[PDB]
Assembly symmetry: D2
Homo-oligomer: 198 residues x 4
């Protein structure tokens, strides 16, 4: 049974970059649905599996990836953010970033274009390629999770679905991404990096 994780902070702790109304809706409504629906899909999948109904299992795939992916993605998203965040990472991660994308601004520039480049709903990701031993930037459609669909290990995620910024930034997604750099929780991203870096 999956659970909606409590936020690591106040809904309005990311002001003015991401406002409280968006965080509240995002967490209490959007994320909450995914969790609920994921639980309903898993329950049904177990039923199909138990009676060897392959058709059922396959039909339930779109819902499981969507809601399951939604849950995975947002749970990480909350942790990637912080009220005292911003700035740049340090240590190995920063060296990895400089090494892999050139500089820190080059990193930002690449991830920004990857996120702005999403046509429709999706996410922008900074991930770790375990087989290449280096970092990597990717974009995922809708709620397709980074690791489950690409193998990469999620480090930092940027939700570019319109519900993630329209109320505040409206159509101008670029303003949304320039704004989000001020609340990245490099402390958590580093943790995720050092985590799979071994």
């Amino acid at each position: 049974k999956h659970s909606l994780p409590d936020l690591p902070y106040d809904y309005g702790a990311l002001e003015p970059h991401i406002n409280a109304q968006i965080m509240q809706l995002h967490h209490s409504k959007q994320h909450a649905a995914y969790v609920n629906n994921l639980n309903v899909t898993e329950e049904k999948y177990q039923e199909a599996l138990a009676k060897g109904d392959v058709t059922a299992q396959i039909a339930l795939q779109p819902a499981l990836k969507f809601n399951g992916g939604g849950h995975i993605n947002h749970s990480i998203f909350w942790t990637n953010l912080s009220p005292n965040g911003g700035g740049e990472p340090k240590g190995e991660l920063l060296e990895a970033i400089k090494r892999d994308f050139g500089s820190f601004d080059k990193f930002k520039e690449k991830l920004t274009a990857a996120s702005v480049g999403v046509q429709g709903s999706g996410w922008g990701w900074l991930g770790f390629n375990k087989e290449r031993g280096h970092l990597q930037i990717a974009a995922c459609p809708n709620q397709d999770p980074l690791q489950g669909t690409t193998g990469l290990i999620p480090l930092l995620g940027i939700d570019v679905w319109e519900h993630a910024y329209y109320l505040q930034y409206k159509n101008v997604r670029p303003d949304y991404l320039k704004a989000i750099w001020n609340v990245i929780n490099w402390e958590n991203v580093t943790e995720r990096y050092m985590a799979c870096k071994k």
Copy 2:
């Protein structure tokens, strides 16, 4: 050279079902981009084509379907709506609807579920299947246009991208669709039906 079509009405003429702020943004910002970008893609496609650059042509496909589809879809969307709309269609169309989906509410119910069922960005469509001689309901991802990707002829379209309702209805898409029935321009939908019905 493609052009952003003037609206057939006042940005606030669809109140309270679809508010003015959404219509203004939707038309002046979202639709306007698609048009602009479509023109830029077509220009570049002509260049690729002229010099036989197949790689270029293929790479430009995502942008052409997206922006081109965006343009097609919204241009129809504006016409499907009206301040004096609502109610139900009459004549053949209504008979076609009753014949094809049962009743009018059954029609609404089916199209509503098709639109609410869109995972991520997309549209809900009532179309005409020229080869089957009957009506048909379909959903399209992102900006993929009805006719260009399915062959069906668009009659009524329901934009379910979040920018189409989030500012007003927030996460509750169902409220958005129940609301939009009050502004359907059956007069234009009928025109489109009688148009391909011959």
Copy 3:
């Protein structure tokens, strides 16, 4: 605990439309592999589901749809063929075919175009739409099963993967389609058709 169905006839019971060699491999080799891989996949599934591992569940989807569908499709395919097969259906099924497609001949033309239409690996199908209550034609890529992927009840499927004819009919698929019509087991298609009518 899915199992390999015994072929309904001898590996060469369909000469000369489809030689015993194509049947031999296609069944003994590839169908078996699909079943084996399927059981292996479902097992990894029960495991991941019990652990609440969503990422793993999503990662197992390509293998589950591909192997469970390959098993679904081919199991149906075998029963859709027969030595005494050929000609055309009688009763209700024929009536539905004339009504829904005009004539059994235009029908074959339809399915053939759908089947010959498949770019790459895939299947052409004659399925039944529970919703609309009538026959419908569809093409499915790779091993995506008709029902789990579209909800249509399969009645008659035509495997158009190159492995289903490339030996005998080489790169000319039409030759394969033209031939296969001589084998179709209309007795089975009718049973499937009747199972979903009332």
Copy 4:
């Protein structure tokens, strides 16, 4: 005005790894069809583009990517093979392979897994990433061309469509992969590799 490339060697210049029959058909028959269909498609294109017909442009996409890509892929494929082919690359290319993949052997293992990994029709590729400035491996479904679909510069492609081995190596693709390594024209791969380095 795309044209059919003359094969670099005789249809049987690659015996016994790939018989002259597979080459014969694959080239004379299918590559030719891709070129012909491509020219036909581009023409319908210039037409639709001149008319400003976006719907038609979008409808022509499957045929354009499929036929222009089939032409792109196979043209490259031919040059990637050679009688005197086999063994391994020297100089920079080898160095990059060891560096980026560990060892030419793990490399082959990689490409093979990618190539054997393709479920359905497709291609396994050894392409170069301009961005990151190093080698990368990728798989493409059906005829989707590597560069137009991923932006990676193709260096070495391995056709894994059943028509490329089903005659000779039957349903066991590994056998085909294992064999093809004996033919690869590392002299060409190096030229392609060098063309995009500086």
